[PDB]
Amino acid sequence: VPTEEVSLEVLLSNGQKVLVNVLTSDQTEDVLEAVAAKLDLPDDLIGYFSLFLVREKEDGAFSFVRKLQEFELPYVSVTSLRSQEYKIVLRKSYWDSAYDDDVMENRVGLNLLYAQTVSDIERGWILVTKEQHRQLKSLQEKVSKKEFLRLAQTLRHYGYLRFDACVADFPEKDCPVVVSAGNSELSLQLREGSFRVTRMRCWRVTSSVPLPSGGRGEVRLELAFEYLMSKDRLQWVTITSPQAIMMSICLQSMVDELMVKKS
Protein backbone atom coordinates (compact mmCIF):
# COMPACT_ATOMS: atom_id res chain seq x y z
CA VAL A 1 0.00 0.00 0.00
CA PRO A 2 1.28 3.49 -0.85
CA THR A 3 2.27 5.28 2.34
CA GLU A 4 -0.26 7.94 3.33
CA GLU A 5 -1.47 9.43 6.60
CA VAL A 6 -5.02 8.42 7.52
CA SER A 7 -7.44 8.57 10.44
CA LEU A 8 -8.23 5.23 12.05
CA GLU A 9 -11.00 4.63 14.56
CA VAL A 10 -10.19 2.03 17.20
CA LEU A 11 -13.00 1.03 19.52
CA LEU A 12 -12.80 -0.12 23.09
CA SER A 13 -14.79 -3.26 24.04
CA ASN A 14 -17.73 -1.06 25.01
CA GLY A 15 -17.71 0.80 21.69
CA GLN A 16 -16.01 4.02 22.86
CA LYS A 17 -14.12 5.59 19.95
CA VAL A 18 -10.38 6.26 19.99
CA LEU A 19 -9.30 8.20 16.90
CA VAL A 20 -5.64 8.00 15.88
CA ASN A 21 -3.62 9.34 12.97
CA VAL A 22 -1.48 6.57 11.53
CA LEU A 23 0.11 5.54 8.24
CA THR A 24 -1.52 3.16 5.77
CA SER A 25 1.74 1.24 5.95
CA ASP A 26 1.90 1.13 9.77
CA GLN A 27 1.88 -2.39 11.21
CA THR A 28 -0.03 -3.65 14.23
CA GLU A 29 2.52 -2.60 16.85
CA ASP A 30 2.73 0.92 15.40
CA VAL A 31 -1.04 1.32 15.54
CA LEU A 32 -1.14 -0.17 19.04
CA GLU A 33 1.46 2.34 20.21
CA ALA A 34 -0.49 5.24 18.67
CA VAL A 35 -3.64 4.10 20.48
CA ALA A 36 -1.72 3.76 23.76
CA ALA A 37 -0.28 7.26 23.31
CA LYS A 38 -3.75 8.70 22.67
CA LEU A 39 -5.07 7.02 25.84
CA ASP A 40 -2.00 7.84 27.93
CA LEU A 41 -1.36 4.15 28.60
CA PRO A 42 2.27 3.66 29.75
CA ASP A 43 4.63 1.90 27.35
CA ASP A 44 5.28 -0.86 29.86
CA LEU A 45 1.58 -1.83 29.79
CA ILE A 46 1.13 -2.02 26.01
CA GLY A 47 1.99 -5.72 25.97
CA TYR A 48 -1.11 -6.49 28.06
CA PHE A 49 -3.42 -5.34 25.25
CA SER A 50 -3.95 -6.25 21.59
CA LEU A 51 -5.90 -5.12 18.54
CA PHE A 52 -8.68 -7.29 17.13
CA LEU A 53 -10.71 -7.24 13.94
CA VAL A 54 -14.42 -7.63 14.79
CA ARG A 55 -17.80 -7.50 13.10
CA GLU A 56 -20.13 -5.13 14.90
CA LYS A 57 -23.68 -6.48 15.04
CA GLU A 58 -26.85 -4.39 14.77
CA ASP A 59 -27.15 -4.33 18.56
CA GLY A 60 -23.59 -3.06 18.94
CA ALA A 61 -22.11 -6.36 20.13
CA PHE A 62 -18.82 -7.55 18.61
CA SER A 63 -18.15 -10.87 16.91
CA PHE A 64 -14.40 -11.36 17.04
CA VAL A 65 -12.76 -12.28 13.72
CA ARG A 66 -9.08 -12.38 14.60
CA LYS A 67 -6.34 -10.90 16.73
CA LEU A 68 -4.18 -8.74 14.46
CA GLN A 69 -0.71 -10.24 14.02
CA GLU A 70 2.63 -8.40 13.98
CA PHE A 71 2.95 -8.38 10.18
CA GLU A 72 -0.55 -7.00 9.57
CA LEU A 73 -1.45 -3.45 8.50
CA PRO A 74 -4.57 -2.63 10.55
CA TYR A 75 -5.77 0.14 8.23
CA VAL A 76 -5.55 -2.25 5.29
CA SER A 77 -6.96 -5.20 7.28
CA VAL A 78 -10.20 -3.35 8.01
CA THR A 79 -10.50 -1.18 4.88
CA SER A 80 -9.94 -4.07 2.45
CA LEU A 81 -13.22 -5.66 3.62
CA ARG A 82 -15.19 -2.72 2.16
CA SER A 83 -17.88 -2.82 4.85
CA GLN A 84 -18.57 -0.39 7.67
CA GLU A 85 -19.62 -3.27 9.95
CA TYR A 86 -15.99 -4.26 10.55
CA LYS A 87 -14.02 -2.51 13.27
CA ILE A 88 -10.67 -2.56 15.02
CA VAL A 89 -10.98 -3.16 18.77
CA LEU A 90 -8.54 -2.79 21.67
CA ARG A 91 -8.92 -5.38 24.42
CA LYS A 92 -6.79 -7.01 27.09
CA SER A 93 -5.02 -9.95 25.51
CA TYR A 94 -3.87 -12.12 28.39
CA TRP A 95 -5.79 -14.91 30.12
CA ASP A 96 -4.64 -15.29 33.74
CA SER A 97 -6.38 -12.66 35.89
CA ALA A 98 -3.21 -12.48 38.01
CA TYR A 99 -1.95 -10.12 35.31
CA ASP A 100 -4.84 -7.74 36.13
CA ASP A 101 -2.74 -6.79 39.18
CA ASP A 102 -0.04 -5.33 36.92
CA VAL A 103 -2.53 -3.46 34.75
CA MET A 104 -4.57 -2.06 37.66
CA GLU A 105 -1.51 -0.35 39.14
CA ASN A 106 -2.03 2.30 36.47
CA ARG A 107 -5.10 4.54 36.28
CA VAL A 108 -5.54 4.17 32.51
CA GLY A 109 -4.97 0.42 32.68
CA LEU A 110 -7.56 0.16 35.41
CA ASN A 111 -10.01 2.29 33.40
CA LEU A 112 -9.56 0.00 30.38
CA LEU A 113 -10.14 -3.18 32.39
CA TYR A 114 -13.18 -1.61 34.04
CA ALA A 115 -14.69 -0.52 30.73
CA GLN A 116 -14.37 -3.93 29.10
CA THR A 117 -15.60 -5.77 32.19
CA VAL A 118 -18.73 -3.61 32.36
CA SER A 119 -19.36 -4.37 28.69
CA ASP A 120 -18.58 -8.07 29.21
CA ILE A 121 -21.38 -8.22 31.80
CA GLU A 122 -23.78 -6.21 29.62
CA ARG A 123 -23.22 -8.53 26.65
CA GLY A 124 -23.49 -11.78 28.64
CA TRP A 125 -19.85 -12.80 28.27
CA ILE A 126 -19.69 -12.87 32.07
CA LEU A 127 -22.48 -15.12 33.37
CA VAL A 128 -24.74 -13.68 36.06
CA THR A 129 -28.43 -14.10 36.91
CA LYS A 130 -31.08 -11.43 36.29
CA GLU A 131 -30.98 -10.55 40.00
CA GLN A 132 -27.17 -10.50 40.22
CA HIS A 133 -26.97 -8.29 37.14
CA ARG A 134 -29.39 -5.95 38.91
CA GLN A 135 -27.11 -5.81 41.96
CA LEU A 136 -23.99 -5.31 39.86
CA LYS A 137 -25.32 -2.28 37.99
CA SER A 138 -26.09 -0.89 41.45
CA LEU A 139 -22.69 -1.73 42.97
CA GLN A 140 -21.25 -0.07 39.96
CA GLU A 141 -22.56 3.32 41.06
CA LYS A 142 -21.65 2.76 44.71
CA VAL A 143 -18.11 1.31 44.59
CA SER A 144 -14.79 2.39 43.07
CA LYS A 145 -13.71 0.99 39.71
CA LYS A 146 -11.06 -1.00 41.57
CA GLU A 147 -13.59 -2.49 44.00
CA PHE A 148 -15.93 -3.28 41.12
CA LEU A 149 -13.15 -5.10 39.24
CA ARG A 150 -12.10 -7.11 42.29
CA LEU A 151 -15.69 -8.33 42.61
CA ALA A 152 -15.95 -8.99 38.86
CA GLN A 153 -12.84 -11.20 38.98
CA THR A 154 -14.86 -13.73 40.99
CA LEU A 155 -17.79 -13.88 38.54
CA ARG A 156 -18.48 -16.85 36.27
CA HIS A 157 -16.50 -16.56 33.02
CA TYR A 158 -14.63 -13.42 33.98
CA GLY A 159 -11.76 -13.26 31.50
CA TYR A 160 -13.44 -15.44 28.85
CA LEU A 161 -14.01 -14.60 25.21
CA ARG A 162 -17.49 -15.60 23.95
CA PHE A 163 -18.21 -16.72 20.37
CA ASP A 164 -21.38 -16.49 18.28
CA ALA A 165 -23.77 -19.39 18.83
CA CYS A 166 -22.76 -22.35 16.66
CA VAL A 167 -22.86 -26.16 16.71
CA ALA A 168 -20.60 -28.97 17.89
CA ASP A 169 -20.62 -32.76 17.77
CA PHE A 170 -20.27 -32.95 21.55
CA PRO A 171 -22.20 -34.44 23.19
CA GLU A 172 -24.16 -35.46 20.10
CA LYS A 173 -23.83 -34.58 16.43
CA ASP A 174 -25.10 -31.12 15.46
CA CYS A 175 -25.72 -29.93 19.00
CA PRO A 176 -26.41 -26.19 19.31
CA VAL A 177 -23.74 -24.67 21.58
CA VAL A 178 -22.21 -21.46 22.85
CA VAL A 179 -18.42 -21.70 23.01
CA SER A 180 -16.25 -19.48 25.20
CA ALA A 181 -12.49 -19.51 25.70
CA GLY A 182 -10.79 -18.66 28.97
CA ASN A 183 -8.95 -19.94 32.04
CA SER A 184 -7.00 -22.40 29.87
CA GLU A 185 -10.08 -24.16 28.56
CA LEU A 186 -12.89 -24.16 26.04
CA SER A 187 -16.34 -24.04 27.58
CA LEU A 188 -19.19 -25.58 25.58
CA GLN A 189 -22.64 -24.69 26.86
CA LEU A 190 -25.16 -26.97 25.18
CA ARG A 191 -25.57 -28.70 30.03
CA GLU A 192 -21.87 -27.86 29.85
CA GLY A 193 -18.56 -29.38 28.90
CA SER A 194 -15.18 -28.01 29.99
CA PHE A 195 -12.22 -28.91 27.82
CA ARG A 196 -8.80 -28.17 29.29
CA VAL A 197 -6.12 -26.86 26.95
CA THR A 198 -3.53 -29.11 28.61
CA ARG A 199 -5.58 -32.15 27.58
CA MET A 200 -5.67 -31.19 23.89
CA ARG A 201 -2.94 -33.02 21.98
CA CYS A 202 -3.59 -30.85 18.92
CA TRP A 203 -6.30 -28.98 17.04
CA ARG A 204 -7.13 -28.52 13.38
CA VAL A 205 -8.90 -25.83 11.38
CA THR A 206 -10.59 -26.98 8.16
CA SER A 207 -12.62 -25.17 5.52
CA SER A 208 -14.77 -26.17 2.58
CA VAL A 209 -14.03 -24.60 -0.77
CA PRO A 210 -15.82 -21.27 -1.24
CA LEU A 211 -19.45 -21.80 -2.26
CA PRO A 212 -21.85 -19.59 -4.22
CA SER A 213 -23.86 -17.17 -2.06
CA GLY A 214 -27.09 -18.69 -0.75
CA GLY A 215 -21.70 -11.07 -3.69
CA ARG A 216 -19.91 -13.05 -0.98
CA GLY A 217 -18.96 -16.71 -1.09
CA GLU A 218 -19.69 -18.97 1.86
CA VAL A 219 -17.35 -21.38 3.59
CA ARG A 220 -18.10 -24.13 6.07
CA LEU A 221 -15.43 -23.90 8.76
CA GLU A 222 -14.62 -26.35 11.54
CA LEU A 223 -12.31 -26.35 14.54
CA ALA A 224 -11.60 -29.86 15.78
CA PHE A 225 -9.49 -30.63 18.85
CA GLU A 226 -8.08 -34.00 19.85
CA TYR A 227 -8.99 -34.42 23.52
CA LEU A 228 -7.62 -36.81 26.15
CA MET A 229 -11.00 -37.96 27.47
CA SER A 230 -9.45 -40.48 29.88
CA LYS A 231 -6.22 -42.47 30.21
CA ASP A 232 -4.98 -43.58 26.77
CA ARG A 233 -8.23 -42.44 25.16
CA LEU A 234 -8.10 -39.57 22.65
CA GLN A 235 -11.30 -38.29 21.06
CA TRP A 236 -11.84 -35.58 18.42
CA VAL A 237 -14.40 -32.88 19.27
CA THR A 238 -15.58 -30.83 16.31
CA ILE A 239 -17.04 -27.34 16.42
CA THR A 240 -18.66 -25.93 13.26
CA SER A 241 -18.27 -22.16 13.42
CA PRO A 242 -17.53 -19.22 11.12
CA GLN A 243 -15.20 -18.15 13.94
CA ALA A 244 -13.15 -21.38 13.94
CA ILE A 245 -9.96 -19.42 13.24
CA MET A 246 -10.56 -17.04 16.15
CA MET A 247 -11.11 -20.11 18.37
CA SER A 248 -7.85 -21.57 17.11
CA ILE A 249 -6.10 -18.26 17.85
CA CYS A 250 -7.44 -18.34 21.42
CA LEU A 251 -6.27 -21.92 21.93
CA GLN A 252 -2.79 -21.00 20.70
CA SER A 253 -2.73 -17.89 22.88
CA MET A 254 -3.79 -19.87 25.96
CA VAL A 255 -1.20 -22.58 25.28
CA ASP A 256 1.47 -19.91 24.70
CA GLU A 257 0.66 -18.21 28.01
CA LEU A 258 0.90 -21.54 29.86
CA MET A 259 4.33 -22.19 28.27
CA VAL A 260 5.57 -18.72 29.18
CA LYS A 261 4.50 -19.35 32.75
CA LYS A 262 6.13 -22.77 32.76
CA SER A 263 9.41 -21.21 31.58
Binding site: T198, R199, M200, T206, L228, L251
Partner: peptide, 15 residues
Protein backbone atom coordinates in the same frame (compact mmCIF):
# COMPACT_ATOMS: atom_id res chain seq x y z
CA UNK B 1 -0.45 -20.72 9.33
CA UNK B 2 -4.25 -20.58 9.43
CA UNK B 3 -5.46 -23.98 8.26
CA UNK B 4 -4.32 -27.50 9.05
CA UNK B 5 -3.00 -29.04 12.25
CA UNK B 6 -1.60 -27.15 15.23
CA UNK B 7 0.59 -29.04 17.70
CA UNK B 8 -0.20 -28.06 21.32
CA UNK B 9 3.08 -27.40 23.13
CA UNK B 10 1.14 -27.29 26.42
CA UNK B 11 -0.28 -30.83 26.10
CA UNK B 12 0.29 -32.69 29.37
CA UNK B 13 -1.18 -36.21 29.56
CA UNK B 14 0.08 -36.51 33.15
CA UNK B 15 -3.20 -36.94 35.07
Amino acid sequence: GTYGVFTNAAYDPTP
